[PDB]
Design an enzyme around this catalytic site. Sequence first.
Site, PDB file in Angstrom:
ATOM      1  N   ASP A 192       5.365  10.342   3.931  1.00  0.00           N
ATOM      2  CA  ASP A 192       5.733   8.555   3.086  1.00  0.00           C
ATOM      3  C   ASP A 192       7.454   8.446   2.640  1.00  0.00           C
ATOM      4  OD1 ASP A 192       4.141   6.309   3.174  1.00  0.00           O
ATOM      5  OD2 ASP A 192       4.790   6.203   1.781  1.00  0.00           O
TER       6      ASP A 192
ATOM      7  N   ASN B  16      -0.347  -1.419   5.211  1.00  0.00           N
ATOM      8  CA  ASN B  16      -1.265  -1.518   6.619  1.00  0.00           C
ATOM      9  C   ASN B  16       0.092  -2.288   7.129  1.00  0.00           C
ATOM     10  OD1 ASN B  16      -1.928  -2.173   8.411  1.00  0.00           O
ATOM     11  ND2 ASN B  16      -3.766  -2.895   7.834  1.00  0.00           N
TER      12      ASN B  16
ATOM     13  N   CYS C 237      -3.474   3.395   6.187  1.00  0.00           N
ATOM     14  CA  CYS C 237      -2.003   3.713   5.276  1.00  0.00           C
ATOM     15  C   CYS C 237      -2.060   3.108   3.657  1.00  0.00           C
ATOM     16  CB  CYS C 237      -1.062   3.434   5.644  1.00  0.00           C
ATOM     17  SG  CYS C 237       0.379   4.764   5.351  1.00  0.00           S
TER      18      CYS C 237
ATOM     19  N   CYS D 137       3.061  -0.685   7.089  1.00  0.00           N
ATOM     20  CA  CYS D 137       4.673   0.126   7.939  1.00  0.00           C
ATOM     21  C   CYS D 137       4.330   1.586   9.240  1.00  0.00           C
ATOM     22  CB  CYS D 137       5.357   1.326   6.670  1.00  0.00           C
ATOM     23  SG  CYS D 137       5.341   0.030   5.205  1.00  0.00           S
ATOM     24  N   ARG D 138       3.353   2.081   8.389  1.00  0.00           N
ATOM     25  CA  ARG D 138       3.395   3.348   9.666  1.00  0.00           C
ATOM     26  C   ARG D 138       1.930   3.122   9.797  1.00  0.00           C
ATOM     27  NH1 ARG D 138       3.394   7.001   6.145  1.00  0.00           N
ATOM     28  NH2 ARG D 138       4.675   7.863   6.604  1.00  0.00           N
ATOM     29  N   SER D 139       0.603   2.154   9.295  1.00  0.00           N
ATOM     30  CA  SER D 139      -0.852   1.779  10.398  1.00  0.00           C
ATOM     31  C   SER D 139       0.139   0.881  11.669  1.00  0.00           C
ATOM     32  CB  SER D 139      -1.017   1.128  10.087  1.00  0.00           C
ATOM     33  OG  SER D 139      -1.596   2.027   8.496  1.00  0.00           O
TER      34      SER D 139
END
Length: 164
Positions: free
Chosen positions: A127, A15, A12, A17-19
């Site tokens: 996002d 790298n 992402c 946040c969501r990852s």
Amino acid sequence: GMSDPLHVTFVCTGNICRSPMAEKMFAQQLRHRGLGDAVRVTSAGTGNWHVGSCADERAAGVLRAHGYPTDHRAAQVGTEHLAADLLVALDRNHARLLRQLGVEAARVRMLRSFDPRSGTHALDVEDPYYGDHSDFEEVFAVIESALPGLHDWVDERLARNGPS
């Protein structure tokens, strides 16, 4: 059969946040069930935003709020990442870059594309730019929804990976 562990690297922008969110989420579950060493979950960012940094303050609160770990060191999409058995892209571009870089669709898969409640193909994930309490827990929901799909994939793959 000495089957080496899986390798799920989430890709992402940032790298941080969501990852790293799913990183600690289902990976913690893995080791909690006894598969932590059976599958190597990792993460990377195509634009190396906070490469070398740690998980974003927002996601840290989210994970810790639910009792999930939040320690992680952001990395960029490199060789070792492209060598993963599963590259969990968060967007059509990240997935594209990985595969063209050396990976392939066999390995590269979208995070929400594991989500059983997705319904339609997920070649692009949301996002949260607004940055509210909703945005943070929302992503958490995205990931937790995909974990039952990411699980099955890594499980099935790690199972078939080595024979007797």
